[PDB]
Point group: C2
Chain length 130, copies 2
């Protein structure tokens, strides 16, 4: 659909999960945008049936859950392959909305690959040493 719209749904979903609701102020503060800009996006999200304070439609909820899943999987992926922890978040934030579901699912299989045998993680770590 749209990276910005997705980023908003992701943030709105997280806020609802964290607080039980999503205030415009909290959205604007989390995205570091002006509250007026949030107002415009919300009205658009409303028109597109992602939501109706504000409440997500089942359509918006399904997307939010997917976006959180993708963010979490990507952090786990970068963490597993050894990226410095402090750099993981910004990298995930910048690539998460530009990956196809095919890539996401293959990354999921990759994470599973390393999780079923610690020897694989060690072998990968050895390569980093080289």
């Amino acid at each position: 659909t749209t990276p910005s719209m997705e980023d908003y749904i992701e943030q709105i979903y997280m806020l609802i999960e964290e607080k039980g609701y999503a205030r415009v102020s909290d959205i604007a503060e989390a995205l570091a945008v002006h509250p007026s800009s949030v107002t415009k996006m919300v009205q658009k999200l409303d028109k597109d049936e992602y939501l109706i304070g504000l409440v997500l439609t089942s359509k918006g909820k399904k997307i939010g859950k997917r976006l959180v899943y993708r963010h979490e999987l990507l952090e786990q992926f970068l963490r597993i392959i050894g990226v410095d922890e402090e750099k993981i978040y910004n990298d995930v934030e910048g690539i998460e909305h530009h990956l196809s579901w095919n890539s996401i699912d293959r990354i999921g299989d990759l994470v599973q690959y390393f999780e079923e045998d610690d020897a694989r993680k060690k072998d990968l770590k050895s390569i980093q040493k080289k």
Copy 2:
């Protein structure tokens, strides 16, 4: 060094390697943008000393070479993990300029990990089957 600037340097570097030179028209066609947009960017890259008959400076060449390496490595990464070939290019294009060097290097180690022992690739493929 914005993502847009990097994408232009990447394209300019590729055109020079492919044809021996980079015409505004070819850059405009490759990026699917208006020539005025290209001109504005080129003037900016000139001001920032990446280029000067578009000719890259050593600064621009170093970056261009890195960007091509990164693009190729990212395609190999998605390829190795099983992403459908047809979807690889668009994914790489959208994430390549949003990954830290730390992530790129660890992805490089990951690619090396699979390339050095095909048994690892087979094991990864078995998981995709589950």
